Amino acid sequence: SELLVNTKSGKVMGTRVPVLSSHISAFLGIPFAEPPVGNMRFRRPEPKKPWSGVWNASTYPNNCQQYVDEQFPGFSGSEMWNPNREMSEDCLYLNIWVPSPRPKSTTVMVWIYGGGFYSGSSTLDVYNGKYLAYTEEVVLVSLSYRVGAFGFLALHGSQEAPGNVGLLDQRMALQWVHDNIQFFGGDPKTVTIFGESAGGASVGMHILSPGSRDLFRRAILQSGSPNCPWASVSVAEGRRRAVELGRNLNCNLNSDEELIHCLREKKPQELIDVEWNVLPFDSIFRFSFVPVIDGEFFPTSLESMLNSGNFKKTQILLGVNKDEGSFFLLYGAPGFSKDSESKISREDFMSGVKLSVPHANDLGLDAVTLQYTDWMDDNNGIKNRDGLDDIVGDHNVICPLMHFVNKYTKFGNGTYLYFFNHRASNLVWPEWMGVIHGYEIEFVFGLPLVKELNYTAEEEALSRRIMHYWATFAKTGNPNEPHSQESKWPLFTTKEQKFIDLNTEPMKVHQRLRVQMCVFWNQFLPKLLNAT
Ligand SMILES: *[C@@H]1O[C@H](CO)[C@@H](O)[C@H](O)[C@H]1NC(C)=O
Ligand SMILES: *[C@H]1O[C@H](CO)[C@@H](O)[C@H](O)[C@H]1NC(C)=O
Ligand SMILES: CC(=O)SCC[N+](C)(C)C
Ligand SMILES: CC(=O)SCC[N+](C)(C)C
Ligand SMILES: [Cl-]
Ligand SMILES: [Cl-]
Ligand SMILES: [Cl-]
Ligand SMILES: [Cl-]
Ligand SMILES: [Cl-]
Ligand SMILES: [Cl-]
Ligand SMILES: [Cl-]
Ligand SMILES: [Cl-]
Ligand SMILES: [Cl-]
Ligand SMILES: [Cl-]
Ligand SMILES: [Cl-]
């Protein structure tokens, strides 16, 4: 039986699914860890105890407990990111799409979802790996991990809530793939992990963490990097937020043991209800429970690891979208709304800058303001809006990524950088939002190949082009087809710093992505805030 696979953890039975007038095998809901429930909440994951009998892997598993976006009820633009399955703390499962007939030893790609470490599901329609598994002949795996306080509550020193357990969930899933993917026809020595935003940051964190390095061959980071102002906190800040969470739930705060005991007795939704009250500043693009620089998963500060080359040396493919910050301004910045063009007044622009750079003093804010303001026309609502959009994307995604790429390439074995600037023709979000954060994903997963989804013929060509770059990179460490007549995606080098745009137009090569603004964010502003 092509749908029956015997693994080291036990037997599993998948289901046959249709895809682009053909079919492939799908094994959904495979458990890789013991349910992290009860006294196991906030604790490191435990491997799933082997089972006798056949595990039914015909349907999607539950999604981890998380905040649910209800800012636009019934709107597909936002609900397509929400959990589409019931939520439960019993959520540590992985899904696998296997070509048919089953391969013997083919390239494997493991997807790590984003969601600011506070949300995300492996079951979203936009993450369906059948199109990619079928089109590129790869074994596509999508894992899951605890988010919110459930996966990142951090009380360093404690052994009940050490922090980073969400990252350990990811690692345990990677370990499972390492040990069992061969049974599904995948090559465990040719595993590429890829993810977007928080998932991209996660990928970078596995590149850094010694305990994850041996579990994969190469990586792809989309709109995310480990060094991002929002992807991690110090052990002290992690502790402060954990304590504050307890304070919000009337917990005994006399000891970690007591705090944890109290937090474990609360219902999931109780923690989620007050999750956002623990942020230290009024801000956007900042999440409460994220990875912590603890000295375990991360030996030293991320910057010192990057400077000394203390990370896995392999090939990486990464990039960003043109308008990473628009989503976050819509949800929290004054003056922005979904049904208007969101032309911003000078006043709202000022408020936006403050929300975007919470760690900056007045001089720092003046610096950012000066850098992104057209003083010949500073009341221009469109320029104010776009300027704010750039500030958010540059500070939170692009410049941190450019810093990572510059540091990684010094020791790496091959870097490929892209700039995705094509807005989907069928995007339901307003036009002012541009090439939105996360909207390159549908292209990576081949949704444009599905007629009923209504993408242009050109967009279908882009998706196929992108999927082939990704899969070819996963397979060989180079996105370019050897001896092909296609345009070549040049390697990114310290010297030339080349990258390509990813859109429906003929591929063009550029250099020094966002270098002017990133020198400001990566070199100048930090010096300024330090000197003042
Ligand atoms: C990658 O490493 C191999 C040796 O393992 C070397 O031959 C090759 O030139 C390297 N490629 C780059 C661009 O670093
Ligand atoms: C999984 O397979 C079983 C066969 O044992 C089938 O009866 C069941 O419908 C499947 N799971 C679902 C959809 O509940
Ligand atoms: C800005 C948006 O449309 S939300 C996307 C959520 N994701 C980055 C984790 C996929
Ligand atoms: C992009 C987002 O959903 S953050 C908004 C959540 N908040 C209302 C609790 C701050
Ligand atoms: Cl076995
Ligand atoms: Cl289909
Ligand atoms: Cl830890
Ligand atoms: Cl930080
Ligand atoms: Cl405490
Ligand atoms: Cl609940
Ligand atoms: Cl607080
Ligand atoms: Cl900041
Ligand atoms: Cl000034
Ligand atoms: Cl830099
Ligand atoms: Cl859409």
Structural domains of the chain, ranges and CATH numbers in brackets: 1-532 (3.40.50.1820)
Report how far ligand 9's centroid is from the alpha carbon of 279 (Å). Answer: 17
Give me 368's structure tokens. 């950012």
| Strand pairing report for 22-31 and 15-19 | antiparallel
Q: Find out whether the beta carbon of 59 lies less than 6 Å from any atom of ligand 2.
A: yes
Task: Write the CB contacts of 188 (distance below 8 Å, at least 6 apart in sequence).
Answer: 108, 177, 178, 179, 181, 182
Report the distance separating Cα 285 and Cα 118, nearest Å.
Answer: 12
What is the structure's resolution, reported in angstroms to one decimal?
2.2
> Is there a catalytic annotation at residue 437?
yes
Phi, psi of 406 (to 5 degrees): -65, -45
Nearest CA owner, ligand 3 atom 5: 438
Phi, psi of 291 (to 5 degrees): -50, 150
Report the distance separating Cα 325 and Cα 322, nearest Å.
Answer: 9
Report how far ligand 4's centroid is from the alpha carbon of 353 (Å). Answer: 18
Instruction: Report the nearest atom of ligand 2 relative to the CA of 59.
Output: 13
Phi, psi of 300 (to 5 degrees): -135, -175
Q: Find out whether the beta carbon of 436 lies less than 6 Å from any atom of ligand 3.
A: yes
Nearest CA owner, ligand 1 atom 11: 413
Technique behind the model = X-ray
Instruction: Report the nearest atom of ligand 4 relative to the CA of 119.
Output: 3
Residue of 78, 121, 197, 288 marked catalytic: 197
Give me 458's structure tokens. 């050109």
Instruction: Report the nearest atom of ligand 3 relative to the CA of 78.
Output: 3
Closest CA to 61 of 15, 95, 84, 29: 29
> Is there a catalytic annotation at residue 324?
yes
> Is there a catalytic annotation at residue 483?
no
Largest CA distance in the chain: 73
Report how far ligand 15's centroid is from the alpha carbon of 222 (Å). Answer: 18
Q: At what angle do helices 381-393 and 346-356 cross, to 10 degrees?
A: 0
Q: Is 139 exposed, middle or buried (0-12, 13-18, 19+ CB in 10 A)?
A: buried
Give me 80's structure tokens. 């397509």
Residue of 156, 403, 422, 437 marked catalytic: 437
CA atoms within 13 A on the CB side of 243: 13
